[PDB]
């Protein structure tokens with residue numbers, strides 16, 4: 001039974017998965033795909049067993065019968081007596097970030113600016129802000145709100161891809177995987193840091209992890225938190241230290257999904273895998289560390305303490321929460337039930 005086939009998205013996650021595979025005695029093996037949607041299809045076909053997904057994709061996967069199995073849990077200063085694997089998930093803060101030097105830019109003056117998104121269909125980088133924007137303008141032309149953007153996964157010849165740069169060679173412009181320079185939390189923030197965009201739609205944790213010497217990548221190496229500002233919904237700007245009172249929403253954590261008939265087996269293998277390669281696991285950091293990838297968030301986010309049990313044996317709708325599930329349905333009206341593949 002207990003071989004789990006992970007689905008990696010892109011060549012970089014593939015490399016990391018191959019390392020995990022080798023260190024696991026081939027308990028985990030790897031399948032690769034160019035996009036998250038493709039990976040979901042591989043899981044539906046039964047050619048892969050699982051992968052960690054942002055909440056927006058969990059919505060896509062859930063409609064096709066896939067279920068949440070274990071969720072990412074980061075550091076917290078409450079619930080601590082309880083062990084990480086048993087602790088409830090706090091969710092993360094979706095935020096809109098701008099440069100302080102870019103004075104006078106607020107939530108009320110984003111029209112015609114340049115934006116940086118993690119990817120299309122993702123929670124913090126797309127679903128939350130575009131949902132909020134459609135709603136406030138009473139219009140579905142969200143592709144004409146910003147003058148130019150980098151929204152991995154949109155038509156590469158549309159304005160929503162204009163700011164994306166592709167890989168080393170300019171190839172793969174706008175693909176929704178790490179090959180694209182401005183993909184994901186880190187990529188979208190880089191897009192803002194290099195002044196390619198006016199605002200980045202990421203999470204709270206991204207800002208802190210790539211400023212004040214926390215990174216060391218050459219583009220982040222000199223960034224300082226005082227150079228950035230959060231855009232609050234009230235038309236006000238605040239230091240990044242004010243996220244708890246200046247965010248767009250709380251997002252449910254990224255979670256591992258698998259086909260329902262495979263959930264229990266995937267779950268067992270993963271709990272044994274994090275005991276070996278997790279934060280203080282038998283072989284981290286001496287041999288391989290599952291939750292570390294040099295600020296690239298490959299397979300899993302780098303700030304992950306552990307993969308936690310769910311409790312309540314939640315369906316995907318209960319896991320995402322009815323608030324966030326109606327938000328996505330209304331936004332997708334711009335482009336009630338049925339699986340896409």
Ligand SMILES: *[C@@H]1O[C@H](CO)[C@@H](O[C@@H]2O[C@H](CO)[C@@H](O)[C@H](O)[C@H]2NC(C)=O)[C@H](O)[C@H]1NC(C)=O
Pocket residue numbers: 075076077093204205206208209214241242243244303
């Ligand atoms: C937003 O994100 C930062 C980092 O993810 C949080 O600050 C971390 O908080 C932990 C304890 O919760 C501290 O021990 C770490 O030292 C902090 N990290 C760093 C790198 O500074 C912060 O709690 C979050 N703020 C809000 C309002 O959510």
Ligand SMILES: *[C@@H]1O[C@H](CO)[C@@H](O[C@@H]2O[C@H](CO)[C@@H](O)[C@H](O)[C@H]2NC(C)=O)[C@H](O)[C@H]1NC(C)=O
Pocket residue numbers: 127128131132135322323324326327330
């Ligand atoms: C966009 O607006 C719609 C319409 O109000 C929001 O959907 C509603 O959300 C509330 C709160 O969850 C429910 O009580 C309503 O029933 C929903 N209405 C409809 C028509 O479905 C949606 O939340 C908004 N999107 C965002 C991102 O805020």
Ligand SMILES: CCN(CC)CC(=O)Nc1c(C)cccc1C
Pocket residue numbers: 071087088089308309310311312313314319
């Ligand atoms: C960590 C995964 N959670 C998602 C929130 C499973 C859950 O169902 N948790 C939960 C808790 C702990 C308290 C109140 C309400 C909810 C539903």
Ligand SMILES: *[C@@H]1O[C@H](CO)[C@@H](O)[C@H](O)[C@H]1NC(C)=O
Pocket residue numbers: 002023024025027276
């Ligand atoms: C692989 O899984 C098997 C089955 O439980 C376990 O006995 C073995 O020790 C595991 N090895 C590693 C390194 O995970």
Ligand SMILES: [Fe+3]
Pocket residue numbers: 054055122123124251254
């Ligand atoms: Fe996310």
Ligand SMILES: [Zn+2]
Pocket residue numbers: 247249250
């Ligand atoms: Zn809030």
Ligand SMILES: [Zn+2]
Pocket residue numbers: 312313314315318
């Ligand atoms: Zn239930």
